[PDB]
Design a protein around this ligand. Sequence first.
Ligand SMILES: [Ca+2]
Length: 346
Amino acid sequence: SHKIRVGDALLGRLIDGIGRPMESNIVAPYLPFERSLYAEPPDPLLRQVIDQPFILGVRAIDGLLTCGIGQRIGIFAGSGVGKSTLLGMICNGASADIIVLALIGERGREVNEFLALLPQSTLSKCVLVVTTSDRPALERMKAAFTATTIAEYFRDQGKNVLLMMDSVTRYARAARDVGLASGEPDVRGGFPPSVFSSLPKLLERAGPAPKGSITAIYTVLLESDNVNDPIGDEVRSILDGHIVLTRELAEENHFPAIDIGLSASRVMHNVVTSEHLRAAAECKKLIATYKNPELLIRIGEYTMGQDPEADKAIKNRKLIQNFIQQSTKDISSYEKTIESLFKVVA
Ligand SMILES: [Ca+2]
């Protein structure tokens, strides 16, 4: 009841919503420790500051929206915009000692499609908390806490942990159904009070620590409708950074489909050099100001301003696009990413 068993043997394993290994082995993993699913957690005694970069191995993010160790980061994405591919790139590229994944509320098919993106070397440092759509709501809700608790266990060993929860949206729908079942009323958008109060309690467990850390990425699944998602809204107000993927970029075959102007890192200025910050700011402005040259040629115009800002954007388009667009096998170290950024704004 509300305790799970943990240990190093969790690494490389598929684990259910309450922490039980799901692969059938004749020899069971050794999991000698019990931990509560809930933590007080790390009392502000004392609370830390985010001041070191957390490298994802994604040029657009590392370059223009740099993450920090112990940050809480949201990725907001609808269907068919390459979310799972981006999550895969992050797991394979991130500077994390241990990855704890919570895969909540999707069908087995989607789980296997994600797992296929992770090579043996990545899986070997992963704990995979998986609760598919068919599982009871209680199990899908608990998966978020199980994952968080396991991340804390590994943090406590001095590991820099990446907690990746796909998705807080489906966690919340599970927690909704549990809450309503207990007799809570709908307060906003079909959600009872319990789900809202759980969000900061979960997110506040990520963060830097004396030894080790937990940097957390939470996905928010966007519906192709105009219905308010109050869970996503509350998350927006808590996060330290947010990455937004758009259908508009996905349909241009622009991947990762990150809209830079809608994305932000509240910690970047604290974890990158002033020169890095300056180059990123120019790159962002160049991205925002760019306009298809076709549009001027078709009206016979010899523009070229003299409009300095717009002229550089066209001149630097291919460089900028090759920088922010990045294939799965298009690998880039943090050193290389920064060197490449300076090149695209030159
Ligand atoms: Ca909203």
